[PDB]
Symmetry: D2
Subunit: 462 residues, 4 copies
């Protein structure tokens, strides 16, 4: 049972919009919206959405496993050895938010302060004394973005597993010699840094120039969660505010995925005429180039929707019905929709590119979708007595931590190793005002709900 | 009753080192060490200290008021009008941590997200609708360090008041015309930006080239809190670890202040021979240039203590008894003292230069000294029923906020406006593992105390 | 009669290596090597060559005209209007070395000081008073590389003509409105800057991703000058030194062009066995990335010549027989060939990327190939009495200038407008120790010839 | 006989303004204006002047020798050893335009291409084979401004000699150990780089904070060439155009030097009333900060001439009679005087800061004053048969070079070593349209003289 199975199960359920039925549904953790900071839903005038892994959640492990195959095939085709062809995606290995250390070739799970929670070299989990040889303070400086790359999005799950596979392969294949910073193959030296850059380029190539997009769209039911409650939520949003789409994808791919997402023999609810996906948005923006979009952006262009190409030049006109934009900046959205940052609830899956930057640069309200939450809630419930056991204790602590972490996968929970929160958890708490396994969870809260978090107090104020 | 009066009152008390007496003393909030993250004191192998506003706390309002006088006199001497001579420091106006907006000339108190809590133009406190003309989202982007300057240290209190004085003066003096971004005086235009830069340069000049240092040292009892419990704490630290001094000051000024701090007719405790301040430190480092010190630093130099000048060239030798260093980097300290970051407790007053950067770049443990805490605790206790009143309510909320804030000063508490925490409070909670009104508060905790904070839980984990 | 016709005519001649025959051949200007600074050929230990427009000279106007077609077709395919399909390359318009001003959309011919010699907007040649409206000092700052792009290589001839075509088209087509800095088309604004960037991207695309390479190689006799005296020159060079190839092209394209260049039923001279092009070089380097190659370069890679792909990793081995490199830096060549800069004669066609940078950064000796020289010599000879007329005079001067310039083309000679040298001429004189219509001209000078230039004297030394 | 003796001798002569007398005076090389590019004096509408070493030429060796003393005294006062007190300025050692190599501690004389003409380590002149150990291609990359500092102005003559003195001292004093890149003194390592930076800082300190200015002004006849023909030239310029002053000095120092320069009991010519120096300029600009002045400049300020301080704020008014400016940019001058670049003749002594940058960034016409030319002309005349001997020859060549160079000093002529022009000579030829031993030489040419240089021809055009 992947998280995307939980999501698709919930997606198959029709919406019961009775006030008491809604209220008891959002009792279950699966269907709750979680609050880091109070947000009064009546003050929200625009709802904005991202597409990939937000509106269009890809099925797991099938989609990761497709991207993994195509990235391997790309690497083999530029000269990596054929043995790579015998790797196969294992979803039980990668957890999201790991850090790849390009100097030494390790995947690290760290807390908000750069302290090491887990260190794996290939598939070899390194323990305290051995880690201290490479990390003498058991700490890394995350600001060293030339050395450390943070594998933040669900698109990075294939490459997280692939780096481990590759380091394991070259370490154990007797053609190569392992050195501190890479592999020697006769007179060629492959550093973990340039290996990492190859994987990163191959992933980029597969999305921009290979066959990932074509293969997804030819089998949409296989690859993409679909939910008849989406047009219902969006039309309800439109009754009280404006709705916008902002995606890093191009128009042609967005049109295919979005058409699929709305492909029901009805519109908002059973019995209603179907309407085109575009009719649900006051503003549609493609090729956004987030996070840059939240700074100086790029030039605002207009899409020619007949052909899927950009019209030539910068668009200088007003918002018109049926127009599709490309590029621009977050200011374009505020200006064309007449909104201030705090009037905007932006719903996205990318902790950095969607959530952190819209919050820090623009003061937008934020909703983080976390697809793995669908499954991590289920593990957190039926391992309560395991977390609670660890909680009491605070040697046996190291053992408890281990079997707690293992239920989630080899790299543990997305949110913690034992009693220590991950970097990713702190940034969720820090930047996401609201968060949930799915944005559909908003459907179960009334129009003007006040989401509440307890006021925060310093230690001396308590 | 300034905070420095509270501190000096506590400083006048001899140390009663009876176990039960220590224990009940640290019951009082004034004498407590507050914990943001757990810290096991037995794992600490080096204690490091900063000097200004940490070991050497300057008396308030007298020292701020001296710096204010000298900065005014500097500005008049380069051509500011003589009316400045009639400003006088008012300690009830500035709160620490304000932001000066150089575009529009406002002092702002903001939260961690850049939301506006208070906006003052000169001495005119701007309310919601008027602020929205210049701040349409009531939010500023703190990353815009060219526009916004954060007045973070206790050294900035004079200039915080001075900017307000200056904006008030030019606004109301009919020789000048007020524009959005500055003042017109015939054919001269003075922007708030270049006005701000003048004040900043004048402050710099007074510390580096004027008479602030000479006037402080000629009346040390007037300007500097002194405490016979300091050599006691430091000698106790030395029994279990190494002790180091790292200051941005030069040697000559440090020698004068430190000699004064230890000037008692005894050493660690009454009856013991006096010893030179230098004997209390394993390592003394001046001209540190923090925060840069916590990155690439500068070249390690050696002070000639006979003359107070640097010897020529880079010092390449080992740690020797009686040597005084200048410049270097935090790595110099780790290497010469044989420590890893987490073995180091660094005690400082500068949230950025001491605390944030040693934590983020190096993984040091951190103790933030907050001198105003001596007084803010006293206000927080006898206005409990005023905070608690506000707490219940959550119109009357706006009124409660106001009379809560006013008890602290015109710019409110250092930690909050009402129910909204300031930027400075969040960074304390974020970067300072421990914090107190004074580092002397450590004296009241046993050698191997475990400071405890409750493990943190996400909303879905609760 | 294009310059490539002159070159191919000379190429068809067999080499007569009799001492007196060589000597009288290099009497003719067509076959001379010209000297800016003295160079003693006996001190040269390595001869290095670039490939495109140096060893492999493309036929004119056919190759420019092919690149022009494909760039137009690329632009139409991303959305430029179909009328572009009716442009056709005119070789009489562009001269090499022009500057495109992206602010105002003009092509400029300038001197070494940035003074304007010619200004054309589309096909409209602007005269003094009108130019002064946009260039009030009749001068541009060439260091403003964001505004001004210098169209330096023979690869830029198509785009030089295309920019003029495009500016002429949009100016005269009544769908668009001409503004100072671009064209308005309803609510789209196309700036000359973003238009320029489109052309530049299209040219890049045609070379990297389109069909220019495939179409050249399928009709090599149509597109590329071939000369049986090339293997003769190279084998003679090899008798006295080392020979190397350094190209920005990839291996596969270099292998096709070079195989073609050596495709004769003989080797160095008639009667000798043919040998593979590779046997003529001590060192072959592809994907050089000049000019960066002359600074920090990139990582030295090794080509797999079976497949045409790079082997994985950085090459750490020595120079071996038959190995082909990719990337690296100029230091790689010095180290593997055991040369110092001044031992190296580097032969190239790119004034900046080949000549200027090897001279300034490394102290290499330089030979600039200037294909248009084949024809400009012919114009300079039979318009002697026209230059000489202008020379005497120094109103009629403006008229003489005009009909002098016109014999070369609409944008005049590559080297001057009348009595004023171009930027390109000064940089030739400044950076190219030697220069010629072809590097084959070296064949006509003995092994240890001393090329002589008169010592230079300041005005007060004369 | 220093060059300043030649200049002061010529300065003592009254002006004979008879047409035939002027004409035969400018026959002598001492009184000629030399032409690199043609300049029609009638097209010049503004004459601009720099002050130091242009209008105010300091006497040699006395002024260099004063700056040398004060820089030594500064270095000793921060801790350099007392032996420095026994250095004494030797004017026969330094030539202007040398390069200090901070890696190895050598002074180099180079040509325009970075080729080594002379290499001295302290006072030890290194010959070919020994130089090749540190410079294997006998070439340096001048663009490496972090390694190489070019000692371009007459203000740098003291420090050129001082670096040599210092390297000689530490090399031969047995307290220090010589390494490749500096000196070891026990546990202190002094690199040539940080030694160089000390000298540079000391020179800066002496000009900005020490006693050089005070000591010059208290003995103006000792330190500064004065010439009654200056007000005559300037008033004649004012009859046909505008005249401006632009200096890097402050107002107070400029007022003292300029008052001195005009201190005659008459104005333009004997018998005329004296007028204040300020009356000779349409525009006076101090604190120019050239070369930055020729790019974005700084904010235009107005000097308060009563006090010598800046008025507060940016000056927004027009040009008014009697106003003195500070800062600004070259555009300020063009706008306030209504000039285009080519209407401006700018007269300066700094090859980079005055001449190169006004020419390259703005298209100004340029006149370089070269005080040493007064003496180098005298050496060039009575060593004609020595240069001419070298000229014919082109072993004995190395010997001729040596005794040619020696007549100028230990570092040879400013313009050449033998038959090889220096960097400084090429930049004179490149950037200075006109040049002379003194700007007063303009007095001897009529109002509308056309200065002529022969049109330049490429080798293939000849
Ligand atoms: O690592 C990557 N390399 C290249 N493209 C990516 C990568 N990750 C996500 N994308 C693209 O980003 C787009 C989704 O962005 P979103 O709708 O704003 O979430 C999709 O079109 C993906 O192909
Ligand atoms: O704003 C300022 N301008 C110039 N110097 C300052 C300023 N604030 C603090 N200082 C200096 O910094 C030194 C104290 O640094 P600390 O011991 O590391 O806290 C003192 O010598 C102060 O003069
Ligand atoms: O403007 C251009 N855009 C992209 N590639 C270019 C351009 N101009 C030249 N090239 C490529 O540069 C290579 C030739 O470089 P060369 O042998 O070093 O002269 C050829 O493969 C060309 O395709
Ligand atoms: O190396 C130096 N360090 C500091 N000031 C210098 C130096 N060289 C020249 N100056 C100053 O520059 C001013 C002269 O600039 P000028 O009139 O524009 O030539 C004088 O006031 C000198 O003190
Ligand atoms: O969250 C971020 O964007 C930065 C800034 O945090 P503040 O400066 O806002 O504390 O923290 P980093 O990840 O570099 O530790
Ligand atoms: O003279 C200068 O300012 C630069 C530029 O010369 P061009 O680029 O104008 O040839 O030459 P450098 O001194 O760096 O060799
Ligand atoms: Mg997304
Ligand atoms: Mg401090
Ligand atoms: Mg080429
Ligand atoms: Mg000067």
């Amino acid at each position: 049972t992947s998280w995307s199975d939980r999501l698709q199960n919930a997606a198959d359920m029709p919406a019961n919009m009775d006030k008491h039925a809604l209220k008891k549904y959002r009792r279950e953790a699966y269907h709750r919206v979680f609050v880091n900071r109070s947000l009064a839903m009546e003050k929200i005038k625009c709802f904005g959405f991202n597409m990939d892994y937000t509106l269009a959640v890809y099925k797991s492990p099938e989609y990761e496993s497709l991207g993994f195959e195509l990235t391997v095939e790309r690497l083999v085709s530029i000269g990596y050895p054929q043995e790579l062809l015998s790797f196969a995606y294992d979803s039980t290995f990668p957890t999201r938010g790991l850090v790849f250390d390009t100097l030494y070739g390790n995947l690290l799970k760290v807390d908000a302060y750069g302290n090491l929670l887990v260190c794996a070299h290939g598939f070899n989990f390194i323990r305290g004394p051995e880690t201290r040889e490479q990390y003498p303070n058991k700490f890394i400086q995350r600001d060293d973005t030339e050395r450390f790359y943070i594998l933040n999005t669900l698109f990075n799950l294939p490459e997280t597993y692939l780096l481990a596979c590759l380091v394991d392969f070259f370490t154990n294949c007797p053609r190569y010699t392992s050195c501190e910073t890479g592999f020697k193959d006769g007179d060629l030296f492959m550093s973990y840094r340039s290996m990492f850059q190859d994987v990163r380029d191959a992933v980029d190539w597969v999305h921009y120039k290979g066959s990932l997009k074509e293969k997804t769209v030819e089998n949409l039911e296989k690859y993409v969660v679909k939910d008849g409650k989406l047009p219902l939520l969006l039309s309800r949003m439109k009754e009280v505010g404006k709705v916008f789409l902002a995606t890093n994808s191009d128009y042609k791919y967005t049109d295919k995925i979005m058409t699929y997402l709305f492909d029901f023999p009805h519109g908002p609810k059973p019995g209603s005429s179907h309407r085109p996906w575009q009719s649900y948005f006051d503003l549609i923006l493609v090729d956004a180039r987030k996070p840059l979009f939240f700074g100086e952006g790029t030039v605002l262009r207009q899409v020619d929707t007949k052909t899927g190409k950009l019209k030539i030049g910068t668009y200088t006109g007003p918002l018109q019905h049926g127009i599709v934009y490309s590029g621009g900046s977050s200011d374009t959205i505020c200006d064309l929709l007449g909104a201030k940052g705090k009037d905007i609830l932006y719903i996205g899956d990318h902790i950095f590119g969607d959530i952190l930057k819209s919050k820090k640069r623009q003061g937008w309200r934020t909703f983080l979708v976390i697809p793995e939450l669908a499954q991590e809630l289920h593990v957190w419930t039926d391992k309560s007595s395991l977390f609670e056991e660890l909680q009491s204790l605070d040697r046996r602590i190291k053992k408890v931590t281990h079997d707690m972490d293992m239920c989630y996968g080899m790299m543990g929970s997305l949110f913690r190793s034992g009693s220590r929160q991950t970097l990713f958890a702190s940034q969720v708490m820090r930047y996401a005002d609201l968060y949930a396994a799915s944005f559909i969870n908003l459907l179960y809260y009334p129009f003007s709900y006040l989401f509440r978090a307890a006021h925060v107090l310093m230690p001396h104020e308590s």
